[PDB]
Amino acid sequence: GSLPKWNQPSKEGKKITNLFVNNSLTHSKVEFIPQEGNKIKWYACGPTVYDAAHLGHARTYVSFDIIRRILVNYFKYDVFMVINITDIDDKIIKRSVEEKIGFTELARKWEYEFWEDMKSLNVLLPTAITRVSEYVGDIVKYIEKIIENKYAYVSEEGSVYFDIDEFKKSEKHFYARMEPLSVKKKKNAYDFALWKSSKPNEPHWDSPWGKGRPGWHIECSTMASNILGDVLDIHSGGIDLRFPHHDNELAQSEAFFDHSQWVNYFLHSGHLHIEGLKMSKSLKNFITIKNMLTKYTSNQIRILFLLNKWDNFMNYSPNGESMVQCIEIDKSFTNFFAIILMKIKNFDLNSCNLYWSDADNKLNLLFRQTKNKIHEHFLDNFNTPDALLAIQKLITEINIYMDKEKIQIGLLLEIKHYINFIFDTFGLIY
Amino acid sequence: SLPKWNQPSKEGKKITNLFVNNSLTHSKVEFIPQEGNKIKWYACGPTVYDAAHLGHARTYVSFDIIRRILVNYFKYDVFMVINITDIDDKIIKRSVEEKIGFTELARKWEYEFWEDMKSLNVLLPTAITRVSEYVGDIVKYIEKIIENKYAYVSEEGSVYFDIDEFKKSEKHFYARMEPLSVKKKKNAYDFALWKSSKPNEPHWDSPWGKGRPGWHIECSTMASNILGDVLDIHSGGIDLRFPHHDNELAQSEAFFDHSQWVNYFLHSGHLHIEGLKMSKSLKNFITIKNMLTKYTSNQIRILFLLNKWDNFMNYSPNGESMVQCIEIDKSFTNFFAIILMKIKNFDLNSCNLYWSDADNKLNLLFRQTKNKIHEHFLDNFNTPDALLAIQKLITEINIYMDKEKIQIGLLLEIKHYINFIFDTFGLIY
Ligand SMILES: Nc1nc2c(ncn2[C@@H]2O[C@H](COP(=O)(O)O)[C@@H](O)[C@H]2O)c(=O)[nH]1
Ligand SMILES: Nc1nc2c(ncn2[C@@H]2O[C@H](COP(=O)(O)O)[C@@H](O)[C@H]2O)c(=O)[nH]1
Ligand SMILES: Nc1nc2c(ncn2[C@@H]2O[C@H](COP(=O)(O)O)[C@@H](O)[C@H]2O)c(=O)[nH]1
Ligand SMILES: Nc1nc2c(ncn2[C@@H]2O[C@H](COP(=O)(O)O)[C@@H](O)[C@H]2O)c(=O)[nH]1
Ligand code: NA
Ligand code: NA
Ligand SMILES: [Zn+2]
Ligand SMILES: [Zn+2]
């Protein structure tokens, strides 16, 4: 009917938190319902490992790390996550001849440094790490099934292409669900390659159609489908990937399983722009995660991303201009934990009075209110900027209470623990 | 002819389908908060005249576990109050035998009690309410009970709860939880709200004369001032259910003139040593400090994790009961040793990360165990079965790490989940 349709999961038997997430399939905020129980099957597109990672990559993976911590630590969902490592790619192939070291040896180098940068930022590793080099055989069988479903064709040179026209014809299949308006050997220019016949002096793999490499998009559909299956609760990535990469993943997986909805919720992180231009290796405006870590700490970098809503675009000001606010917040969190611990330590039950005073009750009321504010923020599509503000306000009032008033030791311990619980959800470490 | 219980409405509340053994209904009922996800919780505290023993440990560690389940696992919001009974006949007697002040004795054993609690990793409550600091509030509480014509004053200057006037009212039933357990008095079963003090005994000025608060009035006063007319949870040991807890309900119902002061009354079962309750008087008791020179806090918490909070349990001394606990503590320790070392020393550069069938089978048992434990916690805090679920999962993880090629991310997830459950249990590794 010229409009793509979206089927919300049924609510019976599912964990309902009334969480709302910005879903790129509906281009709106919708209630999140698991496919099965409280389980969330989640695939996230990974890096292409030919170079150092930069602050833009940090934005995406730290942002979805925070969302993952919110889902699992805060809401107690059960998340099964997969991230691919794209270790075969044209950029890796070209760089390996420039570097005069093996392609595989170059790919491990930058995958290792990528995971070390993620660990440095306190990013949790996914459940499964799926490398393209280890899945080429699975990829080929995936392409075969797409061909048997008559949604792909083979060129004489030995490449394989996705037949978009055959895909559209089916009433159950719509091409480019998320960006409908973004649309030689080929039937049509809009067809894309699943298998590429191998260029000379290029790494290659055996296949029924000839020596070749996987195409850009087939890696993700194959790996995600083998481990997670015919329905994905969440698929994530940066916004630039929405078309053509993610829409093509949907086309390949729908073609493979012959069904209409491979993914219930598609989440796209907004881009990090430096001076109004996206941070890209090509532009030469980029800042490596390692350089960033020599001036600033993991907490400060995470606070930078906490201050910017995950699905919005953000602008980083270099020379620490944007980092000035972050350093202030990290400095005050550190000082807070210092004080409240000294006051808990020096508290003496025998000499203090433990009457529940009016000052105590006022702080307690603010403490329970702040718990409910933060809960609404997380339900409001992971509004970490406002949740972080709630904690700062609560800390300002705790500082006043501790300085003057007589302190209820138990109340202060409870508040320290809640703030610890929220900071663990953020990935901050104090 | 039987008291009725009104379940809170589910509308607007956090509903977990949790079921708790409620002494008011003498059955298992679904737990519904009074307001949203908030739980107002009052727990009867110790009388600070002596060292705490393993029985006190059973009650407070068991309800610490329940509190951790409620807050850490289910993400409820718990506002808790515990009284310290620092004025009491037992404190007065002990203070004269030792020839020390009533307050100096109470502070000493209050301090050792909180130190014993910290040693067992028992979380402190939000508010600690001492009777000596609330004597004025207690008096004003008794006044309102008298104005509602549910209490009367004797010639000596004492005040007594008029049970018969309380029963007459249709909105009030006396002794809801133990209905069959029922001189100056109108009736012998009336109990004192205010006791006229002998001149030597410590006392406080009051409208009816110098006196002390009675046994039960302290708790109704303090819980009502901080938490109010409705208590989501009131907890204590089983022997306290009558007359102490039933009298708390009568006093609070009389004060507020309503029918239900507490939605859910949870009573931990008693710890018996050689078939008799651990009591200072019997001389069968084991202090928490003595216990901690023989066994560790984790081992002691595992003992109470193995015994369901609301059931009676028998401790066999000379380490008979503790042998099982020490084995479990040993196996948790060794499991964490391996999984932590393999996570640290895992090297992404040299490893193969294909999602193998062994990886998929461990993952399936891992998610299955999450659902088993979830059902156990909903089943009235069945920590013994949740603990067994963890043990089963740990046996299979040990095999996986020893033999299979390990998915570093999957092992991190399992390490994180088991830590999350151990924090809910209060274990520290
Ligand atoms: N990307 C995409 N565009 C489609 C599809 N079907 C129709 N359209 C677009 O929608 C317009 C309406 O044509 P119809 O929907 O009747 O085929 C066409 O001009 C075509 O560009 C489809 O499956 N995928
Ligand atoms: N936020 C943000 N994400 C980026 C940027 N550049 C790449 N990404 C994201 O980082 C992930 C991996 O990056 P890749 O290595 O594919 O360039 C992708 O999901 C992509 O969307 C950037 O400048 N900002
Ligand atoms: N425990 C208890 N028993 C009551 C109450 N009201 C009446 N009863 C019992 O019910 C029986 C019937 O007496 P009535 O209900 O006429 O007072 C009495 O023998 C009395 O024991 C009450 O509030 N509490
Ligand atoms: N499980 C258990 N609890 C006890 C024992 N003795 C006292 N308690 C509990 O410990 C708490 C404080 O005891 P108290 O200081 O009032 O003697 C009360 O809630 C009481 O129920 C015992 O032998 N076993
Ligand atoms: Na794009
Ligand atoms: Na009793
Ligand atoms: Zn991808
Ligand atoms: Zn009490």
Domain ranges of chain A: 20-318, 322-426
Using a 6 Å cutoff on CB, does residue A56 contact ligand 2? yes
**Inter-chain residue contact B128 with A364, CB threshold 8 Å:** no
- DSSP string covering B28-89, please? EEE---SBTTEEEEEE---BSSS--BHHHHHHHHHHHHHHHIIIIIT--EEEEEEEEB-SSH
Ion ligand 5: residues, CB within 5 A, are A 240, 243
- DSSP lists the bridge partners of residue A154 as A160
Q: Which residues of B touch A37 (CB under 8 A)?
A: 371
Report d(CA A240, CA A237) in Å as an integer: 8
Q: How big is the CA angle at B351 (ends B348 and B356), to the nearest 5 degrees?
A: 120
Experimental method: X-ray
How many Å apart are CA B405 and CA B401, to the nearest integer? Answer: 7
How far apart, in Å, do the first and last CA atoms of chain B sit?
53
Question: B126 vs A364: CB contact, 8 Å cut-off?
Answer: yes
Helix pair angle (A245-257, A218-227), 10° resolution: 50
Q: Say which of B130, B133, B355 has its CB closest to residue A227.
A: B355
In the three-class reduction of DSSP (H, G, I as helix; E, B as strand; rest coil), residue B129 is classed as strand
Q: Hey, which of A163, A167, A168 would you mutate to test ligand 1's pocket, going by the most ligand atoms within 8 Å of its Cβ?
A: A168
Q: Is B59 near ligand 4, meaning CB less than 6 Å away? A: yes
**CA–CA min distance A329, chain B (Å):** 26
Residue owning the nearest CA to atom 6 of ligand 1:
A2
Given resolution (angstroms): 2.9
- Using alpha carbons, select from B373, B378, B365, B358 the residue that is nearest to residue B413: B365
The distance of A396 to chain B (nearest Cα, Å) reads 20
- The domain B19-315 having CATH identifier 3.40.50.1110: the answer here is no
User: For residue A30, how far is its CA from the centre of ligand 1 (angstroms)?
Assistant: 25
Question: Nearest to residue B61, comparing CAs of B128, B127, B116?
Answer: B116
| Distances from the Cα of B421 to the Cα of A384, B14, B192, B418, angstroms | 26, 21, 45, 5
| HEC readout, chain A | CCCCCCCCCCCCCCCCCCCEEEECCCCEEEECCCCECCEEEEEECCCECCCCCEHHHHHHHHHHHHHHHHHHHHCCCEEEEEEEEECCCHHHHHHHHHHCCCHHHHHHHHHHHHHHHHHHCCCCCCCEEEEHHHHHHHHHHHHHHHHHCCCEEECCCCCEEECHHHHHHCCCCCCCCCCHHHCCCCCCCCCCEEEEECCCCCCCECCCCCCEEECCCHHHHHHHHHHCCCCEEEEEEEHHHHCCHHHHHHHHHHHHHCCCCCEEEEEEECCEEECCEECCCCCCCCCEHHHHHHHCCHHHHHHHHHCCCCCCCEEECCCCHHHHHHHHHHHHHHHHHHHHHHHHHHCCCCCCCCCCCHHHHHHHHHHHHHHHHHHHHHHECCCHHHHHHHHHHHHHHHHHHHHHCCCCHHHHHHHHHHHHHHHHHHCCCC
What is d(CA B345, CA B343) in angstroms, rounded to the nearest whole number? 6
Q: CB A410 to CB B107 under 8 A?
A: no
CA distance B220 to B81: 12
| Smallest-distance ligand from the CA of A252 | 7
Q: Which residues line ligand 3 (CB under 6 A)?
A: B 167, 173-175, 179, 182
* Ligand 5 centroid distance, CA of A294 (Å): 32
What the block records as the tokens of A99 is: 């570097």
Q: Do B349 and A112 touch (CB under 8 A)?
A: yes
Q: What is the spatial distance between Cα B381 and Cα B379, in angstroms, rounded to a whole number?
A: 6
- CB < 8 Å to A81, chain B: 409
CB of A241 shorter than 6 A to ligand 2:
yes
Nearest to A128 among B74, B77, B407 (CB): B407
Which residue, among A119, A411, A414, would best test binding to B if mutated, counting the most B CBs under 10 Å from its CB?
A: A414
Q: What separation in Å is there between the alpha carbon of B126 and the centre of ligand 7?
A: 49
Cβ separation A364–B410 shorter than 8 A: no
| CA proximity to B222, closest of B248, B246, B190 | B248
The whole-angstrom distance between A411's CA and the closest CA on chain B is 5
Candidates 1.10.3470, 1.20.58, 1.20.120, 3.30.1360; correct CATH number of B323-425? 1.20.120
Structure token pair of residue B165 = 């006037």
Report the topology of domain A322-426: Four Helix Bundle (Hemerythrin (Met), subunit A) (1.20.120)
Protein residue with its CA nearest to atom 12 in ligand 2: A47
Query: What is the domain class of A20-318 according to CATH?
Result: alpha beta
Is B44 close to ligand 4, i.e. is its CB under 6 Å away? yes
Q: Atom 16 of ligand 4 has which residue's CA nearest to it?
A: B46
Contact B407 A39 (CB under 8 A): no
Q: Which residues surround ligand 8, an ion (CB under 5 A)?
A: B 44, 219
